[PDB]
Motif scaffolding. Structure first.
Motif, PDB file in Angstrom:
ATOM      1  N   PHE B   1     -11.007 -52.932  44.001  1.00  0.00           N
ATOM      2  CA  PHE B   1     -12.431 -52.849  43.705  1.00  0.00           C
ATOM      3  C   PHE B   1     -12.657 -52.905  42.205  1.00  0.00           C
ATOM      4  O   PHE B   1     -12.257 -51.995  41.477  1.00  0.00           O
ATOM      5  CB  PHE B   1     -13.029 -51.563  44.277  1.00  0.00           C
TER       6      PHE B   1
ATOM      7  N   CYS K   6      -4.602 -62.139  49.776  1.00  0.00           N
ATOM      8  CA  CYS K   6      -3.605 -62.095  48.717  1.00  0.00           C
ATOM      9  C   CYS K   6      -2.938 -63.437  48.455  1.00  0.00           C
ATOM     10  O   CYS K   6      -2.257 -63.579  47.435  1.00  0.00           O
ATOM     11  CB  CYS K   6      -2.519 -61.060  49.033  1.00  0.00           C
ATOM     12  N   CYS K  11      -5.601 -60.859  45.717  1.00  0.00           N
ATOM     13  CA  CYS K  11      -6.072 -59.501  45.917  1.00  0.00           C
ATOM     14  C   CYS K  11      -6.306 -58.804  44.581  1.00  0.00           C
ATOM     15  O   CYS K  11      -5.639 -59.079  43.582  1.00  0.00           O
ATOM     16  CB  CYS K  11      -5.071 -58.700  46.753  1.00  0.00           C
ATOM     17  N   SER K  12      -7.290 -57.913  44.569  1.00  0.00           N
ATOM     18  CA  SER K  12      -7.475 -57.010  43.450  1.00  0.00           C
ATOM     19  C   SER K  12      -6.818 -55.681  43.777  1.00  0.00           C
ATOM     20  O   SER K  12      -6.430 -55.413  44.915  1.00  0.00           O
ATOM     21  CB  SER K  12      -8.956 -56.787  43.137  1.00  0.00           C
ATOM     22  N   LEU K  13      -6.694 -54.843  42.750  1.00  0.00           N
ATOM     23  CA  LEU K  13      -6.201 -53.495  42.976  1.00  0.00           C
ATOM     24  C   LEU K  13      -7.207 -52.673  43.769  1.00  0.00           C
ATOM     25  O   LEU K  13      -6.815 -51.823  44.576  1.00  0.00           O
ATOM     26  CB  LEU K  13      -5.884 -52.831  41.639  1.00  0.00           C
ATOM     27  N   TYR K  14      -8.501 -52.935  43.583  1.00  0.00           N
ATOM     28  CA  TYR K  14      -9.506 -52.252  44.384  1.00  0.00           C
ATOM     29  C   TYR K  14      -9.484 -52.716  45.834  1.00  0.00           C
ATOM     30  O   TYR K  14      -9.780 -51.924  46.738  1.00  0.00           O
ATOM     31  CB  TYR K  14     -10.899 -52.456  43.793  1.00  0.00           C
ATOM     32  N   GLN K  15      -9.166 -53.988  46.075  1.00  0.00           N
ATOM     33  CA  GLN K  15      -9.045 -54.453  47.452  1.00  0.00           C
ATOM     34  C   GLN K  15      -7.860 -53.799  48.143  1.00  0.00           C
ATOM     35  O   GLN K  15      -7.967 -53.370  49.294  1.00  0.00           O
ATOM     36  CB  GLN K  15      -8.919 -55.968  47.488  1.00  0.00           C
ATOM     37  N   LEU K  16      -6.743 -53.668  47.436  1.00  0.00           N
ATOM     38  CA  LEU K  16      -5.577 -52.982  47.970  1.00  0.00           C
ATOM     39  C   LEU K  16      -5.743 -51.472  47.997  1.00  0.00           C
ATOM     40  O   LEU K  16      -4.921 -50.789  48.616  1.00  0.00           O
ATOM     41  CB  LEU K  16      -4.350 -53.341  47.143  1.00  0.00           C
ATOM     42  N   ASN K  18      -8.124 -49.915  49.494  1.00  0.00           N
ATOM     43  CA  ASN K  18      -8.407 -49.589  50.886  1.00  0.00           C
ATOM     44  C   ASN K  18      -7.145 -49.553  51.729  1.00  0.00           C
ATOM     45  O   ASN K  18      -7.163 -49.010  52.837  1.00  0.00           O
ATOM     46  CB  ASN K  18      -9.384 -50.605  51.465  1.00  0.00           C
ATOM     47  N   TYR K  19      -6.054 -50.117  51.222  1.00  0.00           N
ATOM     48  CA  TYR K  19      -4.760 -50.109  51.876  1.00  0.00           C
ATOM     49  C   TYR K  19      -3.878 -49.005  51.326  1.00  0.00           C
ATOM     50  O   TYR K  19      -2.746 -48.835  51.789  1.00  0.00           O
ATOM     51  CB  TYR K  19      -4.111 -51.487  51.735  1.00  0.00           C
ATOM     52  N   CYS K  20      -4.360 -48.293  50.317  1.00  0.00           N
ATOM     53  CA  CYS K  20      -4.073 -46.880  50.204  1.00  0.00           C
ATOM     54  C   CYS K  20      -5.042 -46.121  51.104  1.00  0.00           C
ATOM     55  O   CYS K  20      -6.115 -46.620  51.451  1.00  0.00           O
ATOM     56  CB  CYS K  20      -4.191 -46.403  48.758  1.00  0.00           C
ATOM     57  N   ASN K  21      -4.636 -44.929  51.526  1.00  0.00           N
ATOM     58  CA  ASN K  21      -5.468 -44.138  52.427  1.00  0.00           C
ATOM     59  C   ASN K  21      -6.738 -43.648  51.736  1.00  0.00           C
ATOM     60  O   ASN K  21      -6.721 -42.681  50.978  1.00  0.00           O
ATOM     61  CB  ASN K  21      -4.690 -42.952  52.989  1.00  0.00           C
TER      62      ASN K  21
ATOM     63  N   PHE L   1      -0.814 -55.992  36.151  1.00  0.00           N
ATOM     64  CA  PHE L   1      -1.416 -56.539  37.359  1.00  0.00           C
ATOM     65  C   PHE L   1      -1.251 -58.048  37.387  1.00  0.00           C
ATOM     66  O   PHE L   1      -1.815 -58.758  36.555  1.00  0.00           O
ATOM     67  CB  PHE L   1      -2.901 -56.175  37.436  1.00  0.00           C
ATOM     68  N   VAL L  18       1.512 -50.295  45.057  1.00  0.00           N
ATOM     69  CA  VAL L  18       0.123 -49.858  45.167  1.00  0.00           C
ATOM     70  C   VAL L  18       0.041 -48.536  45.915  1.00  0.00           C
ATOM     71  O   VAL L  18      -0.624 -47.594  45.471  1.00  0.00           O
ATOM     72  CB  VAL L  18      -0.730 -50.945  45.845  1.00  0.00           C
ATOM     73  N   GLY L  23      -0.650 -43.974  51.830  1.00  0.00           N
ATOM     74  CA  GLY L  23      -1.135 -45.343  51.873  1.00  0.00           C
ATOM     75  C   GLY L  23      -1.667 -45.832  53.204  1.00  0.00           C
ATOM     76  O   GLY L  23      -2.777 -46.357  53.283  1.00  0.00           O
TER      77      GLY L  23
END
Ligand SMILES: *[C@@H]1O[C@H](CO)[C@@H](O[C@@H]2O[C@H](CO)[C@@H](O[C@@H]3O[C@H](CO)[C@@H](O)[C@H](O)[C@@H]3O)[C@H](O)[C@H]2NC(C)=O)[C@H](O)[C@H]1NC(C)=O
Ligand SMILES: *[C@@H]1O[C@H](CO)[C@@H](O[C@@H]2O[C@H](CO)[C@@H](O[C@@H]3O[C@H](CO)[C@@H](O)[C@H](O)[C@@H]3O)[C@H](O)[C@H]2NC(C)=O)[C@H](O)[C@H]1NC(C)=O
Ligand SMILES: *[C@@H]1O[C@H](CO[C@@H]2O[C@@H](C)[C@@H](O)[C@@H](O)[C@@H]2O)[C@@H](O[C@@H]2O[C@H](CO)[C@@H](O)[C@H](O)[C@H]2NC(C)=O)[C@H](O)[C@H]1NC(C)=O
Ligand SMILES: *[C@@H]1O[C@H](CO[C@@H]2O[C@@H](C)[C@@H](O)[C@@H](O)[C@@H]2O)[C@@H](O[C@@H]2O[C@H](CO)[C@@H](O)[C@H](O)[C@H]2NC(C)=O)[C@H](O)[C@H]1NC(C)=O
Ligand SMILES: *[C@@H]1O[C@H](CO[C@@H]2O[C@@H](C)[C@@H](O)[C@@H](O)[C@@H]2O)[C@@H](O[C@@H]2O[C@H](CO)[C@@H](O)[C@H](O)[C@H]2NC(C)=O)[C@H](O)[C@H]1NC(C)=O
Ligand SMILES: *[C@@H]1O[C@H](CO[C@@H]2O[C@@H](C)[C@@H](O)[C@@H](O)[C@@H]2O)[C@@H](O[C@@H]2O[C@H](CO)[C@@H](O)[C@H](O)[C@H]2NC(C)=O)[C@H](O)[C@H]1NC(C)=O
Ligand SMILES: *[C@@H]1O[C@H](CO)[C@@H](O[C@@H]2O[C@H](CO)[C@@H](O)[C@H](O)[C@H]2NC(C)=O)[C@H](O)[C@H]1NC(C)=O
Ligand SMILES: *[C@@H]1O[C@H](CO)[C@@H](O[C@@H]2O[C@H](CO)[C@@H](O)[C@H](O)[C@H]2NC(C)=O)[C@H](O)[C@H]1NC(C)=O
Ligand SMILES: *[C@@H]1O[C@H](CO[C@@H]2O[C@@H](C)[C@@H](O)[C@@H](O)[C@@H]2O)[C@@H](O)[C@H](O)[C@H]1NC(C)=O
Ligand SMILES: *[C@@H]1O[C@H](CO[C@@H]2O[C@@H](C)[C@@H](O)[C@@H](O)[C@@H]2O)[C@@H](O)[C@H](O)[C@H]1NC(C)=O
Ligand SMILES: CC(=O)N[C@@H]1[C@@H](O)[C@H](O)[C@@H](CO)O[C@H]1O
Ligand SMILES: CC(=O)N[C@@H]1[C@@H](O)[C@H](O)[C@@H](CO)O[C@H]1O
Ligand SMILES: *[C@@H]1O[C@H](CO)[C@@H](O)[C@H](O)[C@H]1NC(C)=O
Ligand SMILES: *[C@@H]1O[C@H](CO)[C@@H](O)[C@H](O)[C@H]1NC(C)=O
Lengths: 21, 30, 562, 30, 682, 30, 21, 30, 21, 30, 21, 30
Positions: B1, K6, K11-16, K18-21, L1, L18, L23
């Protein structure tokens, strides 16, 4: 407005969630 | 994000990534 | 006949071609059409897809970010006319951000009545120089074309031979076409208004653009003004009424239209089915006629509206009372002023303030026709009823001969108005009657009107001496009430073959005025004989922070040498 | 001198803004 | 002795020469002298009129609109020293609007201590270029001379010969004189402090300008610092007191001076008879000594003072509390800032507002040394405690490291300040703590600091590519948070042999930043070899009415270019001074194109011409003219000449000369220059 | 009598014409 | 002041009469 | 560019003013 | 004097205005 | 207005044109 | 989808996030 | 990144970098 939220402020994903149906 | 002020095609692709499926209709009255 | 399909008023299509089959058969779409935001489309999704049924669109048309599409000659082979009542920033044709869109083939488009065409960010599109907009539009200087495949000169947009008209426009013959096949049709110089047929004969006086037979109202293709039942007509015969500037309907139709908001309920006036009546009028329970009576409050949303184009303008078309404030901000580049006048302030009152910010091409405010009063019940912050900033062409506000102005509250705010000189500003202060309100620096006394000498004082030449090599001018020496402030004499000289319209002189010694022998002069050496010159003088004086002595300028005089 | 191009770019930006403002809210109705 | 006359404190003379005889005997006038407005005088009214007794004036001297007078050599032949305590717009000599005044004869004037000289509207005066002010003054750049007879070049202001020193100043020797008779005296470069005598010997260490005898405190003419009873002294011994920086007086003198306002009643401090005591001090009923105590309010006239010079400034010299408002307006052209500092704000408070309008040369405000509090109990109109307008050189207000600011009421008013960027403006808002007051247009957001990019953002170069004819720079593409606002890249370049310090670039597509492959760059072609260049880049962005994203500029960087083949070695002259020695001399080439390593020298043995071997010289017609392959060579290092040895008598030689700016790898060398020569016969 | 704003030598000669004789002294205190 | 009376305003002869003795 | 000369002329005028202001009131004391 | 003003110099109308009452 | 040195009847008629009405009295003491 | 974000996009870090909890 | 299209063990190690801690859970229904 659009730049009023995403450029004046920064939009959140929850704010854009209303721009999902 | 990303945490950044957004315009143009950046904002367009951001909105398409948010929407994915349907996202937006066009019924103001009908 | 002339229109075998239907109306099917405008709805706009998104995200897939599924809803497109809703708009198949219909002959002329009332309103507008937009197609937008289709990423997952394919070029195969268009070869089995075509609509020759549409010929005219009333208002506008928009294409925005749909992939896989490369042409338009299949989807709309027979769209012909855009009327352009509801416009879109003075455009009716939007072609924008269209990936893979490389050509048009929009050969059947003949006339676009009102509006313009903007093309941007379409890095595949070509065949662009082969399009004479003057055949289709009038104000061709309002068409914006940038960021295209044509902007990196690669496309040989040619046709095999003769067919396509190679017409000299700017430098040489410009071949006119749509594709490598589709030429651009040119009617002759007599069939220009109503269009021509295939061999070139003029159509009927009610046709437009195309006609199936030359000079036949029953065998046109598109009506000029009005349609009625296989006949393009000049007006409505009784008992019919004009609807949306294109047809004649009976009392029953527009009657039963009203019965459905129980949103644009309608009435009838001047043999026309119209939305609403202006001020001083009344409805009718019988026939919905705008009857005159004794005594139109266009109450805004939050008392405020940014106004930028005709699309903003037609929302306030024909209003008389504004229960709000207006913001005039047009980063333009083209004078909208006539069409701006065409649907604006036949009003007298503004409840709130008025704002004019950063508008570029507005040379005047004469399009404000009837305006008299500002209530100013909501002020601009800083206690202003009025605002003015950054107007690079504004010189005249109004002629104060017949124009009036009544101001209840609030103040004036004048900055960076480089051709707005202070004389008419003080006249506005006078006719406003609110001169006892403006504090210091409510007027920028450095930037307002600092591009042309305006105010009052005129130099008058006492003596003229000419030669073929010498020029001497003598004028009455003006002296300000502080004679020390005069620092010099700015002179502008040049030659002038027409009459359609630089040196300095030190000030001489004042020292008295029984006989001030100080009639100042400059000798010019650089003269050509038999040559007409244009010369005028400005007085260079000292600025002061007070009401400064305005300084003098001379007349542009023309002197022909020996 | 060329400041008309400077405001012309802002005009382009405003044209970018307005279409985006059209696209923005037909969807939140709740 | 040293001063036979008296004090006779300064009284100024008007309308006729009648009151002039009141000021005859006195040798050094305390205060000032003005002579003004005598329209009904005659030149005969001055021939019977002279005052040699005056030698020094403390404060200043003024001449204003008196008719019939042409000189000053008679009226004041022997004025010598101006101290300049009370100045006059930083002047002490006023020569102004004097009709018929054509000369001075002021040869005896030697040193003016403090102040300057302005001369104006005197359309008869000449002999002015013959006046070295540096001998008399220190800051000669504060002397305004205009509207005079010398301004229409007519006066031959000459002297017959030698006498008058013809010293070079700017273009040539300037003959220094006062009249056609009176030369301008020059003391030598060691007697400069205290003056010199007639033969040029240095005077005593307390003399000044002139001395009657060399090295004698009892036989000076003017004291350097202080006077005491036939001796110029360095200080006042006890129990004497420094009075007005020129003498030593006893206790009874300054004692009884106090007893006459019953206006400047006096006290004593630091062995000095002074007007008043500063803050924390108290008078004494016994001896009027500025005693320290617990806890100086300079209440203004109408709480207000326009301040424009030292004449304004010394009225608030030494003040601690200002019970009023201040207005700073100096239409100047000369920095008075040190002298401005020297008698200014050892204060903290201003009871009313502060105004700064239209001052030109005030680059800073650091001369406000201890200034802390702004009360603002009377505000500027428009509800301001502070004002600022039209300050063409003002850049810094203060360093906010240790300088502080407390503002009680009022607001800020910032307009037309083209070298005052918004950064220190908002810092002043911060340190003031009054940020929640200022509305829109309390700061002109279009004129303030619009001559240099200031604020924060710095460009950083990623890659540098150099050549002898190509330049490429690569740097991080900065983008403001609205990426559309970037209009382009402003670049400034020039060459710079020193280091004591134009094109534009379109922005690329942003479009992403996982791999924003958009590192912007520009190629320069216009390069000179071996040449040092100075380049820096600024970012051109769109103005916004809000708090605009301040935009970036780059560092000034210095890059020397590489070096190509040097030019033709100019003028090869090949002389043979002996039968086997040939000097070859040359000039450097037009383009060295790098540091020249050496000179490649080729001499080639040209044989005699072959047609001469089969000709019958015994027949009449015997007219004889008196005239890869490794050739012998030389690398002449650091010399523009070469004599060549081991050469044949009677053999012509071809010579191929080149220069070389590179030697150790793969010699970059010049193109060939040719000459031919012949050795002497034996 | 001129009816005009006055400075410089104009004002000087005006003041001399007004004064004629003595006109102005210089005793603020003495 | 001087220009405050003769240049800002216009001096009268009576105003300048105080500038006679 | 040469605006320092422009303010320099005003400086000259101010210097004119101040001497005149000195000359002006030593006389009205009444 | 008279020729001192009108013949030595040239009189002005304002100078002669004192020779009106 | 002539700009010329004046004497005799020229100056006399000039003075009469300036004066018109009364112009000059004759009270040095009374 | 995964390569839809990806590999099709990046992918962005913000997109991933959500793939952190 | 990194700003690059990602698959395989590159994408796996990217996802582990990440996530770090937990996760991802596995409760679609429970
Ligand atoms: C396209 O077809 C039209 C049909 O006649 C051609 O004529 C234009 O028609 C419009 C509609 O009436 C005219 O606009 C009118 O202007 C008046 C002011 O003059 C205004 O009061 C009306 O409300 C209306 O807006 C327009 O003037 C007229 N133009 C011309 C040149 O006749 C039009 O020319 C055709 N386009 C081309 C490129 O041939
Ligand atoms: C004329 O004579 C003086 C006598 O010494 C020459 O020197 C100047 O003397 C004054 C007084 O001592 C110095 O001023 C002082 O400056 C210090 C700061 O530097 C300040 O704290 C004191 O309050 C005082 O103002 C001055 O600096 C000094 N100047 C020089 C160049 O030595 C003067 O040089 C003689 N004039 C000429 C043209 O030689
Ligand atoms: C486009 O036209 C076809 C043809 O039918 C005509 O239009 C219909 C709306 C109706 O008025 C018929 O009498 C006309 O002949 C439409 O196809 C018809 O669709 C209807 C369903 O609405 C179906 O019951 C009919 O059997 C169809 N007839 C034929 C010949 O196919 C079609 O729906 C029209 N498209 C749109 C968007 O209206
Ligand atoms: C009054 O007008 C209505 C509507 O007009 C119809 O639509 C117009 C756009 C145009 O196409 C006209 O020719 C149409 O008549 C009439 O109602 C319709 O009449 C037609 C007659 O051919 C009929 O087929 C339709 O079914 C009717 N519509 C409905 C909804 O029933 C009406 O007849 C007109 N009355 C008179 C006296 O002319
Ligand atoms: C200038 O000095 C002369 C000389 O007298 C000396 O100065 C006096 C002030 C006084 O101190 C004398 O003792 C000195 O010898 C003055 O002329 C004398 O004036 C006084 C009255 O003022 C008179 O009684 C004497 O007779 C005068 N003597 C002579 C020789 O003329 C003169 O007045 C002084 N002028 C000024 C302005 O101080
Ligand atoms: C204390 O000083 C006073 C004043 O000093 C005199 O004035 C100075 C400007 C300087 O010129 C000194 O040399 C003077 O002495 C003395 O009063 C004067 O004393 C002298 C003695 O030579 C005498 O001739 C004067 O007439 C005195 N002045 C008056 C007005 O009468 C005083 O004597 C000194 N006292 C001591 C103890 O030293
Ligand atoms: C602008 O003027 C108005 C009118 O005086 C000010 O508004 C008043 O504010 C006071 C206290 O804030 C209220 O008691 C009044 O009722 C207000 N009057 C109105 C008509 O609103 C306002 O403060 C002024 N603003 C500025 C910036 O000066
Ligand atoms: C500047 O601010 C002051 C502070 O409010 C205003 O002065 C007040 O004015 C009212 C009526 O005019 C008085 O009753 C108050 O006593 C005043 N207060 C003070 C502290 O003076 C003033 O009107 C403002 N002026 C402008 C131009 O904004
Ligand atoms: C608005 O202005 C109209 C024209 O004004 C007339 O001409 C000018 C020169 C003035 O003399 C004005 O008084 C005249 O009436 C008027 O017809 C109308 O009454 C004006 N309205 C108001 C409210 O002033
Ligand atoms: C004025 O400033 C003096 C110096 O400030 C000191 O250094 C800076 C870096 C700050 O950290 C500041 O807080 C330090 O005190 C002070 O000595 C003095 O107290 C200050 N006075 C006031 C009233 O703030
Ligand atoms: C001017 C014009 O486009 N006229 C067209 C013609 O080209 C087309 O062939 C015909 C239908 O067959 O309709 C009409
Ligand atoms: C440097 C200087 O001026 N010294 C003077 C000298 O010229 C003069 O001759 C003498 C007295 O006559 O006094 C001393
Ligand atoms: C087309 O889009 C609409 C709404 O976006 C949706 O209801 C429909 O399922 C879509 N159809 C296909 C085939 O994607
Ligand atoms: C000189 O001026 C003074 C002061 O104005 C005056 O008292 C005196 O009479 C004048 N003397 C002459 C001769 O004019």
């Amino acid at each position: 407005g659009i730049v009023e939220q995403c450029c004046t402020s920064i939009c959140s994903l929850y704010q854009l969630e209303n721009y999902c149906n | 994000f990303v945490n950044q002020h957004l315009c143009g095609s950046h904002l367009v692709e951001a909105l398409y990534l948010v929407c994915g499926e349907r996202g937006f209709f066009y019924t103001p009255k009908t | 006949h002339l229109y075998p399909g239907e109306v099917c008023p405008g709805m706009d299509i998104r995200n897939n071609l599924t809803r497109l089959h809703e708009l198949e058969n219909c002959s002329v779409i009332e309103g507008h059409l937009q197609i937008l935001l289709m990423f997952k489309t394919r070029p195969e999704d268009f070869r089995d897809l075509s609509f020759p049924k549409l010929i005219m669109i009333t208002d506008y048309l928009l294409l925005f970010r749909v992939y896989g599409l490369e042409s338009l000659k299949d989807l709309f082979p027979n769209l012909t006319v855009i009327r352009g009542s509801r416009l879109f920033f003075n455009y009716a044709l939007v072609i924008f951000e269209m990936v893979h869109l490389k050509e048009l083939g929009l050969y059947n488009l003949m006339n676009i009545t009102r509006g313009s065409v903007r093309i941007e960010k379409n890095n595949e599109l070509c065949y662009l120089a082969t399009i004479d907009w003057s055949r289709i539009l009038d104000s061709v200087e309002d068409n914006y074309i940038v960021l295209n495949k044509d902007d990196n000169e690669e496309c040989g947009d040619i046709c095999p031979g003769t067919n396509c008209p190679a017409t000299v426009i700017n430098g040489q013959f410009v071949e006119r076409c749509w594709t490598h096949s589709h030429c651009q049709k040119v009617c002759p110089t007599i069939c220009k208004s109503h269009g021509c047929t295939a061999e070139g004969l003029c159509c009927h006086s009610e046709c437009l653009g195309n006609c199936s037979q030359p000079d036949d109202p029953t065998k046109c293709v598109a009506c000029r003004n009005f349609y009625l039942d296989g006949r393009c007509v000049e007006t409505c015969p009784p008992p019919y009424y004009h609807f949306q500037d294109w047809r004649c309907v009976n009392f029953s139709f527009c009657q039963d239209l009203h019965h459905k908001c129980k949103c644009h309920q309608y009435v009838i006036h001047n043999n026309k089915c119209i939305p609403e009546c202006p001020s001083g009028y009344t409805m009718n329970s019988s026939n919905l006629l705008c009857t005159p009576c004794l005594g139109k409050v266009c109450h805004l949303l939050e008392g405020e509206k940014t106004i930028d184009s005709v699309t903003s303008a037609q929302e306030l078309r024909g209003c008389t009372v504004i229960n709000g404030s207006l913001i005039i901000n047009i980063r333009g580049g083209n004078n909208l002023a006539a069409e701006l006048e065409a649907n604006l302030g036949l009003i007298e009152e503004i409840s709130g303030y008025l704002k004019i910010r950063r508008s570029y091409a507005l040379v005047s405010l004469s399009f404000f026709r009837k305006l008299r009063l500002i209530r100013g019940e909501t002020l601009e912050i800083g206690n202003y009823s009025f605002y003015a900033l950054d107007n690079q062409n504004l010189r005249q506000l109004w002629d104060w001969s017949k124009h009036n102005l009544t101001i209840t509250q609030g103040k004036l705010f004048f900055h960076y108005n480089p051709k707005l000189c202070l004389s008419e500003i003080h006249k506005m202060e006078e006719v406003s009657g609110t001169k006892g309100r403006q504090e210091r620096n409510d007027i920028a006394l450095k930037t307002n009107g600092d591009q042309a000498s305006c105010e009052n004082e005129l130099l008058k030449f006492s003596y003229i001496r000419t030669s073929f090599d010498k020029i001497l001018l003598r004028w009455e020496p003006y002296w300000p009430p502080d004679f020390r402030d005069l620092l010099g004499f700015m002179l502008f000289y040049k030659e002038a073959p027409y009459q359609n319209v630089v040196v300095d002189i030190d000030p001489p010694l004042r020292s008295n005025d029984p006989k001030s022998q100080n009639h100042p002069g400059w000798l010019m050496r650089g003269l050509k004989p038999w040559t007409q010159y244009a010369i005028f003088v400005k007085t260079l004086v000292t600025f002061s922070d007070e009401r400064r002595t305005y300084g003098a300028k001379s007349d542009i005089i023309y002197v022909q040498t020996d | 001198a060329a400041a008309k191009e400077l405001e012309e770019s802002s005009f382009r930006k405003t044209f970018e803004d307005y279409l985006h403002n059209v696209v923005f809210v037909p969807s939140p109705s709740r």
